[PDB]
Each structure stands twice: as C-alpha cells, then as structure tokens.
Curated annotation (Swiss-Prot):
Component of the SIFI complex, composed of KCMF1, UBR4 and calmodulin (CALM1, CALM2 or CALM3). Interacts with E2 conjugating enzymes UBE2A and UBE2B. Interacts with RB1. This is E3 ubiquitin-protein ligase UBR4. It comes from Homo sapiens (Human). E3 ubiquitin-protein ligase involved in different protein quality control pathways in the cytoplasm. Component of the N-end rule pathway: ubiquitinates proteins bearing specific N-terminal residues that are destabilizing according to the N-end rule, leading to their degradation. Recognizes both type-1 and type-2 N-degrons, containing positively charged amino acids (Arg, Lys and His) and bulky and hydrophobic amino acids, respectively. Does not ubiquitinate proteins that are acetylated at the N-terminus. Belongs to the UBR4 family. The modification Phosphoserine is found at residue 415. It is linked to Episodic ataxia 8: A form of episodic ataxia, a neurologic disorder characterized by episodes of poor coordination and balance. EA8 affected individuals have attacks of unsteadiness, general weakness, and slurred speech. Additional variable features include twitching around the eyes, nystagmus, myokymia, and persistent intention tremor. Inheritance is autosomal dominant. The gene is UBR4. The UBR-type zinc finger forms a pocket that mediates recognition of type 1 N-degrons. In addition to substrate-binding, the UBR-type zinc finger probably positions substrate proteins in the proximity of the bound and activated E2-ubiquitin conjugate to enable their ubiquitination. Constitutes an atypical E3 ubiquitin-protein ligase composed of a hemiRING-type zinc finger, a UBR-type zinc-finger interacting subdomain (UZI) and an N-terminal region that can serve as an affinity factor for the E2 conjugating enzymes UBE2A and UBE2B. Compared to classical RING-type, the hemiRING-type only binds a single zinc ion: a hydrogen bonding network is present instead of a second zinc ion.
Length: 542
C-alpha cells in the first residue's frame, strides 16, 4: 500500500509532502509490527516450504523475517504451537517446521538462494534500463525496490559473515558475485539519473550528457585527481550547487557496519531489527525533500559494493579485469562518489595498492578516455560544456604526455583509435574558440618536441597514429585548415592568436616532413594537396 505514490508524485514532478511521507512511514511501521506479532499461517509455512510463487506481491521481506525467526527454536516453538492451535495436524506441523528449518548449511543456502533470486528479478527488470546511457528520471526504481534490495543485501551479507566465521560457500558466492556486480552498475546509473535529470533547466539532453561526462571525469576520492574536481567546479554554478547538495546528503541515517554485530539491542536474530532501522532511514529520506529516492540509492549502492568486496575476498568465479572495470568509474565519478572509497578498496584488492601500476594504469586510462570523450563527443556547445573544461584537460593531456606511464597509456589509446587526429578533426568545429586551436597546436607541438628531446616508442606510435590523418574527410580537413589559416577580425578580435595558430600549424607540418617522423609521407601530401585550393582562393578572392 502506498508503494507507487512516490513513483506517481515524482512522475508528475511533485515532491511527496511531509504529511504523505510521514503517513507511508507510519503505515509501514504498523503493518510490520502486525505481521511480526501474528503467527505465520499454514499456507504461508507451506510456501516457505515450497516457494513456487516468486512472492512478487511484497512477500520477499516477510519471508526473510520468518526464516530468521524459525532459525530460533523459541520461534519454532511459538509458531509450531500456534499451528497446533491453528488446527493444522501436529505432525504436519512438525514436518513443515523441520523442512522450513533447513538445519545445517542448508539454512545459509536457503538465505543465499532467496536473495539470489531477488537479485535476478531485479536485474531482469532492468532489461529496459540502459547501463551506458542516461536513464529517464521515471526509469529510477521506487523506494520500495530500493529498500527491499537494501534489506536483501542486509541479510545475505550478515548470513554469509556468520557462515564464514563459523567455518574459520565458494559456489554460494560464485553465483552472488555476478548478480550483485550488475546491480551496482545499474544502481550507479540510477544515482546519476536522479542527480543528472535533477539539474534545473534554468536542461537539454545534449547539455545533460555533457554535464554527466564532466562529473564522471570528476573524481575527488583516493588518488588526488587534478582534473576531475577542476571540471566539476567548472560546471555551471547551478549544476555545481546541485552536485554539492547531492554530496551533502549521506547514508548516516541507515545503520552502518557493526550495528548488527553489536546485536542491534536485539535478542535472537538482530539482522531483522537492522533491516527495520534501514527501512526507517529510507522513510526518513522520503520525509526530506532533498533527493530522497537516491539518498536511499546512495546507501543501497554502498551496501551492494560492500557485499561485492566481501565476495571478491573469496576466489568465486569473478573475472578480475571485469570487476576492476565495474569499480573503475565508481571511484572516478561524483554521482557514485559515495562508494568511490569502497571502489578504491576493491581496486586495492584486485589492481593492488592505490600506488600500484595496475591501479594507476586503470585510473589514468579511464581518465584519458573521459577527457577524450569530452574533447570529441562533448565539443559541441549543445553539451552545455564551457570551453574551459576542454582546454583545462588539454593541459592535463599534455601533463600525461610528461608522465612516461600516462604517456604510454595515452599512446596505446590514441595510436589505436587515431584520437590525436580526432582532436584536430574536432578543432575543425567553428563553435570552438581560436584559443582551442592554439591549445591543440601546442599539445601536438609538445608531442613532437618531447619526442625530439627524449625519443621513445610511445612517441613513435603517435606519429604512426597521425598516418591515419592521411585518411580523413577532405572537406572536414579543409574546413579545419580554413579555420586555422583564415583570420576574420569580425569574430577573432585576437588576430595575433590567429597568427600563433598559423605558426604552430607550420611547426607541425615541418615536424611531419622530417625524415625521422613516423607520420609518413602520405599525410604530408594530403595536407599539401588540400592547401592548394586554399591558396588558390587566397588569390581568387585576393
């Protein structure tokens, strides 16, 4: 009851009033007590023994509650005596209770599999969800699914901890890792969707994706990124304030690690009380009018990453690089910065120390990929990205050239995708400032010079990359050459900067024509031929 009210009022772009939020909390807290004091009925004990239905109609939690109860005999007794009163045959009762008890490791498995199936359900429901694309603010799940999934983790986790300490299963975690892994990435998109779409219009999906890419590149956790935070600040003050409000929100309301370990002031099974406190914190976020749904997503995602790290601890069947890929953006992003610390821990686990090459290798590679994405797929002003961002990382890109390790990482990506060419091809965009042209020219200038001052294969490979420039759109290349040479004082009041652009283009041509250059002869001719019409025009129009 009242589970889709938030989905509805948020669908109508309306904040659930405190009265309504409070009512939802009041209602859930009451029915939860009632379900708890009322003895489990025969049909439902049979279900706990059969479970043919997927319990889609809000029965997943109740089940865990009663299983935890049954684990304890007092409850076994209480429930079995109620079944005798209920009118169920006494021996039937005994058998059911024994079957529901799943004594031995079967109890741990019973828990594992139920949470596994809830995971599966959630994943499948996510089929409409796009992992690498911006999700509509309606694709975000209701707090119901958020807290239910959060409660599901709150259980598998504790149960497995217990099992492992007792052991002091591999296949049990072998199935949990993949299921959890997908959810994290999916909920990561939900956190972004809740933050991105929240941007105040006073925003175009083009602008929305621009802001998304910028805040992703932005990383303020673990290693001190000197580019992501800068671009995050560069974001419009409005967008910047939205991001600040998102980060201001925390998961402190929800009980943290160790609370159930402290028995949560609860006898028998304290995990049930921990899950109840988690639901109470979810309802408290609902009362708050500040990003309530994802405040819960922020916690659910944290719990998911915690469970993921737990699973990584054991071999399972996890694919090390794949798990690294999932935790990589989680660390390098402002929307999922909540788990950025836990993702860094996961990387220390699989990549190694935060100063280990692998770790740094992934960090910087992803960083370049993002910068590049902003340089080529966010150059258009429609992305709503100020020119400051592109030029800011353009300097960081040169900084990476200086770092031999980062230079090699950039070299591999740039040489394989001809990204260097794309940078000049992007420069063709007339919307980009003449300063962008100037900046681009230095970058390549310093690529060629650094090669001359200190020759190495990475630099040889970027010149092999510029050989791909030989094969570019002739019109686009000319359009780019035109922007570089033609000096209109109407738009470019800084003709001196236009002249610096001309000089740096001359320098790059001289570098490519050098015998030891790896750009090859084809590129030189390509440029030469394209300039011929330009020259002719400089004589035709005088």
């Amino acid at each position: 009851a009242g589970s889709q009210l938030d989905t509805v009022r948020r669908k109508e772009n309306k904040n659930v009033t405190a009265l309504e939020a409070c009512a939802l909390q009041y209602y859930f807290l009451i029915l939860w007590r009632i379900l708890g004091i009322l003895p489990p009925s025969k049909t439902y004990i049979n279900q706990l023994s059969m479970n043919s239905p997927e319990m889609s109609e809000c029965d997943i939690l109740h089940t865990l509650r009663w299983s935890s109860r049954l684990r304890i005999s007092s409850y076994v007794n209480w429930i079995k005596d109620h079944l005798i009163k209920q009118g169920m045959k006494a021996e039937h009762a005994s058998s059911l209770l024994e079957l529901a008890s799943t004594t031995k490791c079967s109890s741990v498995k019973y828990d594992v599999e139920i949470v596994e199936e809830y995971f599966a359900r959630q994943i499948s429901s996510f089929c409409s969800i796009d992992c690498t694309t911006i999700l509509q603010l309606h694709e975000i799940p209701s707090l119901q699914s958020i807290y239910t999934l959060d409660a599901a983790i709150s259980k598998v986790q504790v149960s497995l901890d217990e099992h492992f300490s007792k052991m002091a299963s591999s296949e049990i975690t072998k199935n949990l890792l993949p299921a959890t892994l997908q959810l994290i990435d999916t909920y990561a998109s939900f956190t972004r969707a809740y933050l991105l779409q929240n941007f105040n219009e006073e925003p175009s999906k083009e602008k929305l994706q621009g802001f998304a890419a910028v805040l992703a590149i932005g990383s303020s956790r673990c290693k001190a990124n000197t580019l992501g935070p800068t671009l995050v600040q560069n974001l419009p003050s409005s967008v910047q304030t939205v991001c600040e409000s998102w980060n201001n929100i925390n998961t402190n309301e929800f009980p943290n690690i160790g609370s159930w370990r402290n028995a949560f002031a609860n006898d028998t099974i304290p995990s049930e009380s921990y899950i109840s406190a988690v639901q109470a914190a979810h309802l408290g976020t609902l009362c708050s009018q500040s990003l309530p749904l994802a405040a819960s997503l922020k916690h659910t995602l944290l719990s998911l990453v915690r469970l993921t790290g737990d699973l990584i601890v054991w071999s399972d069947e996890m694919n090390p690089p794949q798990v690294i890929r999932t935790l990589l953006p989680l660390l390098l992003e402002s929307s999922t910065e909540s788990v950025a610390e836990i993702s860094s821990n996961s990387l220390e686990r699989i990549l190694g120390p935060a100063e280990s090459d692998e770790f740094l290798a992934r960090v910087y590679e992803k960083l370049i990929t993002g910068c590049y994405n902003i340089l080529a797929n966010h150059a258009d002003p429609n992305s709503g990205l100020d020119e400051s961002i592109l030029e800011e990382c353009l300097q960081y890109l040169e900084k990476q050239l200086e770092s031999s390790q980062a230079r090699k990482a950039m070299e591999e990506f740039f040489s394989d995708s001809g990204e260097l060419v794309q940078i000049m091809m992007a420069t063709a965009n007339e919307n980009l400032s003449a300063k962008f042209c100037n900046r681009v020219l230095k970058f390549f200038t310093k690529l060629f010079q650094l090669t001359e001052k200190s020759p190495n294969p990475s630099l040889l490979h970027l010149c092999g990359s510029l050989a791909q420039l030989a094969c570019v759109e002739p019109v686009r290349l000319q359009a780019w050459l035109t922007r570089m040479t033609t000096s209109p004082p109407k738009d470019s009041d800084q003709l001196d900067v236009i002249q610096e652009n001309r000089q740096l283009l001359q320098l790059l041509t001289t570098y490519i024509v050098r015998e030891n250059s790896q750009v090859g002869e084809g590129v030189c001719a390509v440029l030469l031929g394209t300039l011929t019409p330009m020259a002719t025009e400089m004589l035709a129009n005088g």
